[PDB]
């Protein structure tokens, strides 16, 4: 199918408790697979996958390099925006930066991406035509002013259409055995009496990846997407994803109602209902 | 400064056996600012060795975290997960219930 | 791999 490549980047100050934390983490689809964290004993970019490893010691010492002068202009730029944004030097703030790419099964540029957010807001974004920003208010504006002056956007251009895909490629076939291996939900519905008159099914997903799903309830055909209660995708800790769909049900109108099952490694959605 | 009060999931990596080894998870979401405090709790007092993973965001900004260790469950014991965060007044405490 | 420009100050 299509993949993905993600770089996140967070820096965290914290007045009198030292310099910013500054935490990258690097993911391919819904794999990590490279992290680096500024308070770690002696702070190195580490593979987290085993398909990463091979690369040598330059490619380690380079992905290194670049953290830390990240790290650094985070830091920077932390006390760049309170001035931008008329803050105290008191409190603690927050800088969260993703890039990266999309491609599709040909392995062709889907779409790239280099997007910012101050204190968990839109700050600056770069657009689809990889060649303008949008900046979510005055602040921003200054650092699109700066970023369009020294020609920021074709220099990302050029790595999204170029290395970012080059690399998610080569990392793809590296890693073939598990990058594109989708696993499919294991699937069950449960039955738990409320009282007497009403019941709780839980439609169950389990043991998925990727973490992109489709659970839905339907009451005699009909999607109950205002009474489905719906809890967010969670990692199982093993590269593998949960989730669960419930539904409350008259007592004896159990048989009107089924679990529908979307997921890429499925040949065709799944219906299931509950077995007594 | 805008802040997004943290979801909470606590559950096991696999189906609960009792005397069977597992992981017991706590899943913090959905959270802003980062700063978080998560505990794992069996009967009550805090579990000592808890791995978590390396902090992330989502698509809209806000964090994720997982907190996990492993664990053998049992009948007789009560897991929990307890959570800390600016915008709670008192921390949260989920328990661990191996039907969801 | 990663990119780094050969400033991005904000």
């Known amino acids: 199918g299509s993949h993905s490549m993600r770089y996140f980047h967070t820096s965290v100050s914290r007045p009198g408790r030292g310099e910013p934390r500054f935490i990258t983490v690097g993911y391919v689809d819904d794999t990590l697979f490279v992290r680096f964290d500024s308070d770690a004993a002696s702070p190195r970019e580490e593979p ?15 992905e290194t390099q670049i953290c830390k002068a990240k790290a650094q202009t985070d830091r920077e730029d932390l006390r760049t925006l309170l001035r931008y944004y008329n803050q105290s030097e008191a409190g603690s703030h927050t800088l969260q930066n993703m890039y990266g790419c999309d491609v599709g099964p040909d392995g062709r540029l889907l779409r790239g991406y280099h997007q910012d957010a101050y204190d968990g807001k839109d700050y600056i974004a770069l657009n689809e035509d990889l060649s303008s920003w949008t900046a ?7 650092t699109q002013r700066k970023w369009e002056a020294a020609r920021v956007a074709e220099q990302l251009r050029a790595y999204l259409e170029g290395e970012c895909v080059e690399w998610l ?17 294991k699937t069950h519905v449960t039955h738990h009496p409320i009282s007497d008159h009403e019941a709780t099914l839980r439609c169950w997903a389990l043991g998925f990846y990727p973490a992109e799903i489709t659970l839905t309830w339907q009451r005699d055909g009909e999607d109950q997407t205002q009474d489905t209660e719906l809890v967010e995708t969670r990692p199982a800790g093993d590269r593998t994803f949960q989730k669960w769909a419930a539904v409350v049900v008259p007592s004896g109108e159990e048989q ?9 490694g499925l040949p065709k959605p799944l219906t299931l209902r509950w077995e007594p | 400064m805008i802040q997004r009060t943290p979801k909470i ?7 609960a056996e009792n005397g069977k080894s597992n ?6 979401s959905g959270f802003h600012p980062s700063d978080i405090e998560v505990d794992l709790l069996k009967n009550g007092e805090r579990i000592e060795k808890v791995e978590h993973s390396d902090l992330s965001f989502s698509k809209d900004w806000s964090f994720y975290l997982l907190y996990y260790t492993e664990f053998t469950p049992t009948e007789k014991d009560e897991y929990a997960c307890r959570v800390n965060h600016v915008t709670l007044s008192q921390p949260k ?3 661990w219930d191996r039907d969801m | 791999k990663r990119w780094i420009i050969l400033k991005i100050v904000r």
Do not use: M
């Not at chain 1, 009107?256 to 890429?264: I, K, S």
């Open chain 2, 9 to 15: 999931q606590v559950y096991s990596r696999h189906p």
């Open chain 1, 136 to 142: 979510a208010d005055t602040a921003a504006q200054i």
């Open chain 1, 256 to 264: 009107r109602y089924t679990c529908h099952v979307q997921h890429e």
């Open chain 2, 23 to 28: 992981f017991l998870n706590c899943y913090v």
């Open chain 2, 93 to 95: 405490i989920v328990k």
């Open chain 1, 48 to 62: 987290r996958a085993p398909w990463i490893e091979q690369e040598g010691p330059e490619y380690w010492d380079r």
């Open chain 1, 169 to 185: 490629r080569r990392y793809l076939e590296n890693g073939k055995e598990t990058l594109q291996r989708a696993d499919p939900p």
